[PDB]
Enzyme design. Structure first.
Site, short mmCIF file in Angstrom:
data_model
loop_
_atom_site.label_atom_id
_atom_site.label_comp_id
_atom_site.label_asym_id
_atom_site.label_seq_id
_atom_site.Cartn_x
_atom_site.Cartn_y
_atom_site.Cartn_z
N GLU A 131 -15.09 37.69 133.21
CA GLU A 131 -15.91 38.83 132.83
C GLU A 131 -15.45 39.32 131.45
O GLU A 131 -14.26 39.56 131.23
CB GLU A 131 -15.76 39.95 133.85
CG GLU A 131 -15.91 39.50 135.30
CD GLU A 131 -17.32 39.08 135.65
OE1 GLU A 131 -18.25 39.41 134.89
OE2 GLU A 131 -17.49 38.41 136.69
N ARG A 138 -35.26 29.91 135.46
CA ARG A 138 -35.59 28.64 136.09
C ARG A 138 -35.75 28.70 137.61
O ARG A 138 -35.41 29.70 138.23
CB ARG A 138 -34.52 27.62 135.68
CG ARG A 138 -33.11 27.92 136.19
CD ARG A 138 -32.19 26.71 136.08
NE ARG A 138 -30.82 27.02 136.46
CZ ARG A 138 -29.77 26.88 135.65
NH1 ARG A 138 -29.93 26.40 134.43
NH2 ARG A 138 -28.55 27.20 136.07
N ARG A 166 -23.40 27.86 128.09
CA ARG A 166 -23.86 29.15 127.58
C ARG A 166 -24.15 29.19 126.09
O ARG A 166 -23.62 28.39 125.32
CB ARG A 166 -22.85 30.22 127.97
CG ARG A 166 -22.80 30.35 129.48
CD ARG A 166 -22.02 31.55 129.97
NE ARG A 166 -22.00 31.54 131.43
CZ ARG A 166 -21.14 30.83 132.15
NH1 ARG A 166 -20.21 30.10 131.55
NH2 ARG A 166 -21.22 30.84 133.47
#
Lengths: 345, 345
Positions: free
Chosen positions: A217, A91, A154
């Protein structure tokens, strides 16, 4: 076990692309293709399709014929199958997402394939990952977004485009126990799809926030077998198993998943600063399930993440190609590196 | 669980010390003392004793009276007991090692206490760690250079100086399974000596080399009980257990071992470059054995390692004091930060 050599790819000149991160690359034959990118932070750059010839070591811009992509985007990705390139998502700052396009490298023209974000069709995604095989383009993860002050989320799903059918389908959902992630490793390895590491949304309210968000992470590894349409979580091992990380270079060579660099600590301000980036390379043997560091001689690429990467062959050696990204200075780079594998895979 | 606030200590002026890493600090009363240091890489700086007053927020230089340390060293360390400072070890570029000295902060004079590297006495060390209790100064680990073209090794032993008796003795050797280490965490916590993480010599030829050396970042934790003269290895846990690391700020506050920063990846050229440095803080609850990150409000210290650190109390709050070090730019810093613990510990 996995032995090889790091090389800095010489760039002699031509129409060289500005330094960038968060972009897509792919190779067909002796040509590298480059699309999209971010620089300065949160800003896209251009929508030219850059072409690097490995014989001349020079850059050019591919003819903008056909259905030219309407947006200059970051967080986009690109893969190669045969003589066609496929661009999906990403985007701009104004939250306009790139749709799904192919580029025919022979006729040198773009084709619009799928309008993204429609009901029942593949969604608009940015910071997703992509891979491919003989008859599919695959998209995993990344983050959706409504409007400016929306809470973006997500994906944990894979969208699969059947090239022969010209049709999208979502693959089986791995379920709630599987982390939704952007900037994850995603590769086809010896006929199966592997998802590994990346930047995860938490599925446990007990995980504490860092800088106001629980995001962290990942170090988890899954594989999807098209032959059975089943997901499995893979327990990987080794003294040199890499610490949790995201936005790393990755490519598949035989039984090896090969990675380099990546974000190992979050930035306090999301993508504004560079966080902490790794200068280390790791490879996973998908047969023994053992991780090991690899080294590549005197050339040692500096800390970086948000690079573009792909698998290709250079001077007769398959390996991991790394282009662009951000450095710990927070500047983008135009540098290109290739880790040429010497040993059997 | 561990809650607190990061503060940047404002430094108004006086005889302010040049930026440095690999040096020692300690606090007595309302004064911070600073000695030794590295800048540029592999180069020492001075042998002045700098003094920071927390009431005036200004620097001065302590009278260089008595047996002034003969060498300007890096990799030296300093702890405080009562009104005396104790300096041990470190070296210069020429492999001249610092001996063991005290400084009387009241009488303002150095006193030479022990010649290092003699038979039956404490060895010369650099990049060792230090802590202390009521009647002892303790030294753990670090590296001993033989001659110029010598190889060097690490210690896994503790030397303990009984202050009242003025005598050194070595504590029980924890044996071969225990890593010889430099830049390790070393603290007295609730009556026990804790050794944790650090930069280890390998005791296994199966561990592969990196950049020509097997040396690696430890994540192991041991504790020694003087009451029993026993070593025990401690299994620590947590989703937010820190990745392997060395050269971090660290301090003890009640049951907590509190750390910040540190080397998480080796530099290709040893101490020449900055490697990869963490910008994150972790704390270990020595009762639950759980690691957790901590945050301290809007002030977030940037990536650093090779800092000097200690425990002190500032404005009625116990906490972690961080001074100097190197940054990911590979520059030294003169910055000073304090993590003020707010809850009981």
């Amino acid at each position: 076990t996995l032995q090889g050599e790091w090389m800095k790819v010489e760039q002699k000149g031509g129409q060289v692309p500005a330094p960038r991160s968060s972009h897509g690359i792919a190779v067909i034959g002796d040509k590298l293709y480059c699309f999209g990118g971010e620089d300065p932070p949160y800003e896209s750059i251009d929508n030219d399709l850059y072409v690097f010839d490995f014989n001349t070591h020079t850059w050019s811009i591919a003819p903008a014929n056909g259905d030219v992509p309407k947006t200059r985007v970051l967080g986009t990705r690109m893969v190669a199958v045969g003589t066609k390139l496929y661009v999906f998502g990403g985007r701009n700052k104004q939250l306009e997402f790139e749709d799904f396009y192919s580029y025919d490298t022979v006729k040198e023209e773009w084709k619009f394939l799928t309008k993204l974000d429609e009901k029942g069709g593949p969604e608009a995604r940015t910071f997703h990952s992509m891979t491919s095989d003989e008859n599919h383009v695959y998209v995993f993860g990344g983050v959706s977004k409504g409007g400016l002050n929306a809470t973006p989320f997500r994906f944990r799903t894979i969208e699969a485009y059947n090239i022969a059918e010209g049709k999208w389908a979502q693959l089986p959902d791995p379920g709630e126990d599987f982390e939704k992630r952007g900037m994850a490793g995603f590769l086809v390895v010896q006929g199966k799809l592997w998802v590994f590491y990346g930047f995860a949304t938490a599925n446990d309210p007990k995980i504490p926030t860092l800088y106001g968000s629980q995001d962290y992470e990942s170090n988890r590894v899954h594989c999807y077998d098209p032959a059975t349409q089943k997901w499995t979580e893979v327990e990987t091992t080794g003294f040199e198993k890499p610490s949790r990380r995201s936005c790393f270079a990755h490519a598949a060579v035989g039984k090896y998943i090969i990675i380099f660099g990546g974000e190992i600590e979050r930035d306090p301000e999301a993508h504004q600063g560079p966080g902490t980036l790794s200068r280390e390379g790791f490879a996973l043997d998908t047969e023994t399930l053992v991780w090991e560091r690899y080294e590549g001689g005197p050339i040692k690429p500096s800390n970086r993440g948000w690079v573009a990467s792909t698998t290709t062959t250079i001077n007769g050696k398959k390996g991991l190609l790394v282009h662009g990204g951000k450095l710990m200075t927070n500047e983008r780079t135009d540098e290109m590196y290739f880790f040429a594998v010497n040993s059997s895979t």
